[PDB]
Amino acid sequence: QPVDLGLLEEDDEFEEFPHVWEDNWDDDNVEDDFSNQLRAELEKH
Amino acid sequence: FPQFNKDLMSSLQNARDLQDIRIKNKERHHLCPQPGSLYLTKSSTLPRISLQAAVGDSVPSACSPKQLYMYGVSKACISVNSKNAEYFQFAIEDHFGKEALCAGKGFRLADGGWLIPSDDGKAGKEEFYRALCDTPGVDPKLISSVWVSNHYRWIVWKLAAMEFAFPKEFANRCLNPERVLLQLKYRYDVEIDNSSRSALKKILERDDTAAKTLVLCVSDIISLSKVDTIELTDGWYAVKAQLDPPLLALVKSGRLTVGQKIITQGAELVGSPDACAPLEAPDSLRLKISANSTRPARWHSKLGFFHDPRPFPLPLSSLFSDGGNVGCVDVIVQRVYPLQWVEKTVSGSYIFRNEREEEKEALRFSRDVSTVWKLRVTSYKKREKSALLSIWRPSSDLPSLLTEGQRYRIYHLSVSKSKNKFEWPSIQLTATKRTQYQQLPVSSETLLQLYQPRELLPFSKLSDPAFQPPCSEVDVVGVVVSVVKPIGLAPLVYLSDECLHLLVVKFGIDLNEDIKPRVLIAASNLQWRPESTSRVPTLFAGNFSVFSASPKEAHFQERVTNMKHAIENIDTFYKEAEKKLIQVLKGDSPK
Predict the structure, then answer these.
(1) Hey, are the CB atoms on A34 and B298 less than 8 Å from each other?
(2) Can you give the residue range of the structural domain that contains A3?
(3) Cβ contacts of residue B575 below 8 Å, gap of 6+?
(4) Which cysteines are joined by disulfide bonds (chain B)?
(5) Contact B165/A8, CB-based, under 8 Å?
(6) Whole-angstrom Cα distance, residue B504 to residue B582?
(7) Residue among A17, A35, A23 nearest B316 (CA)
C-alpha cells in the first residue's frame, strides 16, 4: 500500500483555532528535523 | 497535444465558450454548497497520516541528479522555485495521452470541473481557475482570478517539493492536474464555505491580529532598497516581514534560505492596520519578526498558528545585542544588588543614588525619579553568560520573591541592550510591562554548579593565582589605613586585616563620608580583577558597591567585631605599625 494522499495530514492543513524551539540561532550543527526542510531543498535544487 | 493548426484549435475554443456559458449560468441560482473529494475525506474520521509518519522518520533529502528517473520525477516539477510556481504549466500531453487529448472536448478532472487545455496544450492559473468555476458547488462569483492564482502558487510549490524532497514516498503522485484541482476546490471548501481562515488571514484581516506564535515559511528574499527583507507565506497567503539586524544578517549570510520554516512568538503587524484582506494588503505593511523570538522549525511541524502562546525559553547565552526583545529565560539568580533611586536629570541623562543618597538629596531638596532593582542572573542550562536583569519601578512584593540561589523563569524580560566599551558579549535584560516571574526548583548539584553563595573575601586570597571569585565580585571587611583623594579622579581607601595584609579600593562612586582611618569598613559588591603580583591588590568600587561604618548585615558584624577584636590585642602598636608598612609598600625606588 502507498501513502493515501487523501488521508495524509498535509503541511498546510492549518488548525483554525487550537526540543520544539532550538537553542542558539548562530547554530551550525549537522543533523535532524531542522537540517534540511522539504521545500527549502527544492529551492537549493 | 495534436498539431492540428485548426480544428484542435477550434474543438477547444468551442468547448470553452460552451463552458463560459455554464459558469455564466451558475449566476442564475443560489448554488447550494457541495464539498469536494478532499474536504470530505479529511473531514471524515478515517485514521489520518502525518507527513512525518508517511515518510517514516526520514527527512527532506534532495533528488540525486540521476536516480530521479529511478522513481521518475518530472524534470519539469524539478524545475520550480517558490516564485515561478504561479506558472509552471502542466503539459496536458505528458498527463493524458493522445485520445481525448486530441479531441477538443478537454478533460473533466476530479470534482467535475473541466480542465480545458490552452491552444498550445498547456494548463495554468487562468486555466485551472476557469476549471474551478466549472466545478460543482463552486460559485464563480466568490473567487477572483487573483485568488486561484495565489492558491495555485503554493499548491504546486508544495507538491513540487514533496516529490522532489521525498522522491520515493510521493515519487510521482503529487504534481499533476487531478490534484492541483482536487485541492484547489479544497482550499475553496475550506476557506469559502466553511470559513476556516489562514493565520495570516485572521492576522492581516484584523479578526485576530494577535500576531503571536506563527509557523511561517520563507517564500522569497525581497530584493529592493541589496537585500530588503523576505516574504513569509503560511501556506495560504504571504507577507514581507520587517526584519531586525541580527536576523537580516542571517539572510545575507545565507543562514535563512528560502523554503525554510520559522517559529515566532514576537510577531508584530507594522505598517498598516485598518483591517484588509490578504490579497488586497497595503504595500505599506510588514509583519515584524524578531531574532530573539524566532527560530527554525521542524521540517514537518505545520504552517500557521502553533499550540501554546507560552514563550519558549531559549538560552540566555544567545540573544542578540540588537536582536529584538526575549520572551522567556530560565535563569538562576546569581546576585542581588542594592536598590537605586535614579533621578532623571533635566537637560538629559539621570543621576543614581542609594537608599541613603536619596534621603540626603531628599531633604536637601518636581523631583522625578524611579527606583531600579538590578540583579545578576545566569541561564539554568550551562556555560552561563551571567546577564544583568534590570527591574524598574519594582513592585514591593518583588524583593521578598526574587532571591539569590533561586531558579526563576522570567518572561518578556527584555529590551536587551549593552554593547559599548569593550568586547561584545554584553547583553542586558530589562523587565517589561508584561514581564512576569515564575519560580522553579533546582537540583542541589545543578545549582551548586552555577551558584556560589556570598562568602567573605579573605585578603590572602587576592594574592593567589588560582583565585577566581564568583561574578568577579567580592564582599569585604577591613581596617581603613589611609584615604587618598588625588586631584582629578581616583580616590583611594587602603584597607587591612589583622595580619596587616594589605589591599586597595579605587572608588567609582563618592566616598561614603564615615570612611576615615581607624574605621572598620564593611564592603559589599566590590569589582574584582586579577591582582596577584600586585604589592597590594586592587578592588574597584562600582555603582553596585557599598560601604557601611556599621553594617546591618549579620555575618558582617560577626566579623567587623571579631576582627575589631584580634586587632585590639595588637593595637599596642597597630595602626602605626600598619601605616609604617603601607608607607614602604610604595617602594622599589630606583638606585
Answers:
(1) yes
(2) 1-45
(3) B479, B481, B517, B518
(4) none
(5) no
(6) 11
(7) A23
Q: Where are the alpha helices (DSSP H) in B89-168?
A: 92-96, 125-133, 145-165
What is the least distance, in Å, from the CA of A39 to any CA of chain B? 5
Q: Using the beta-carbon criterion (under 8 Å), do A37 and B260 form an inter-chain contact? A: yes
Strands (E), B454-581: 473-479, 482-484, 492-496, 502-507, 520-528, 538-548
Q: How far is CA B254 from CA B58, B83, B221, B227, B249, in A?
A: 24, 18, 11, 12, 9
DSSP B502-532: EEEEEESS---SS--TT-EEEEEEEEE---T
How far A15 CA sits from the closest chain B CA (Å)? 7
CA B215, CA B298: separation in Å to the nearest integer?
10
Do you know the residue count of chain A?
A: 45
Experimental technique used? X-ray
The CATH architecture one would assign to domain B454-591 is: Beta Barrel (2.40)
Are B350 and B271 spatial neighbours (Cβ–Cβ below 8 Å)? no
Return d(Cα A1, Cα A18) in angstroms, integer.
32
Go through chain B and tell me how many residues it has: 591
CA distance B9 to B18: 14
Contact call for residues B114 and B106 (beta carbons, < 8 A):
yes
Is there a contact between B129 and B149 (Cβ–Cβ < 8 Å)? yes
Distance CA(B238)–CA(B433), nearest Å, equals 31
Cα gap B74→B93, rounded to integer Å: 13
Instruction: For an interface test with A, give the residue of B43, B46, B48, B73 to mutate (most A CBs within 10 A).
Output: B48
What is the three-class DSSP state of B403?
A: coil
Sign of the dihedral through C-alpha B486, B492, B498, B500: negative
Residue B589 CB contacts under 8 Å (≥ 6 apart), including other chains: none
Q: Cell numbers 517514516 correspond to what residue?
A: B56
Give the resolution value in Å.
3.4
B39, B189 Cβ separation under 8 angstroms: yes
**Domain count for chain A:** 1
Shortest distance between the Cα of B466 and any Cα of chain A, in A, equals: 32
Q: In 10 A of CB B499, how many CB atoms?
A: 12
B160 interaction partners in chain A (CB closer than 8 Å):
42
Whether the Cβ atoms of residue B428 and residue B448 lie closer than 8 Å to each other: no
Q: CB count, 10 Å around CB of B456?
A: 13
Cell of B403: 532571591
C-alpha cell of residue B132: 474551478
User: Do the Cβ atoms of B329 and B440 come closer than 8 Å?
Assistant: no
CA-CA distances (angstroms) from residue B110 to B134, B181, B335, B510? 11, 7, 68, 83
Place of cell 533546582: B442
Per CATH, the number for B197-310 is: 2.40.50.140
B96-113 as b/e, with b when 16 or more CB fall inside 10 Å? beeeebeebebbebbbbb
Sequential DSSP letters for B196-220: ---HHHHHHTTSSTT--SEEEEEEE
DSSP string, B264-304: ES--EEES--S---GGG--SS-EEE--TTTEEEPPSSS-SE
Q: Does A31 touch chain B (CB under 8 A)?
A: no
What are the angstrom distances between the C-alpha of B462 and each of B47, B138, B504, B532, B588? 69, 82, 10, 6, 21
